[PDB]
Every structure is written in C-alpha cells, then in structure tokens.
C-alpha cells in the first residue's frame, strides 16, 4: 500500500506547500518499485 503510505509521509515531512504539491504530483505519475524509492529516498533527504 505504498502510494498511500509515501503521500503521509509527504503530509508528514513536507512543510514547504510548494514541495508538497511537487512530490504529489510526482507520486501520482509514478508506479513501479524503482521510481517510488526515489521519490521516498528524496522526501527522507528533504527532512535534513
Ligand atoms: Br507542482
């Protein structure tokens, strides 16, 4: 059940309004293992 769990965690991470739109959009185009990973190692990175 990623998509749903990736999307709190940009609710959760993300303050910034503008990334949080930007990730979302970029969630809802991706599907396949590889691509979620990325967005997930990116929203992890933008929390440091
Ligand atoms: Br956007």
Known sequence: GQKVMITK?????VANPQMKQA???????ASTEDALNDIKRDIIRSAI
């Open 9 to 13: 965690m940009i609710t959760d991470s």
């Open 23 to 29: 990730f979302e959009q970029r969630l809802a185009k």
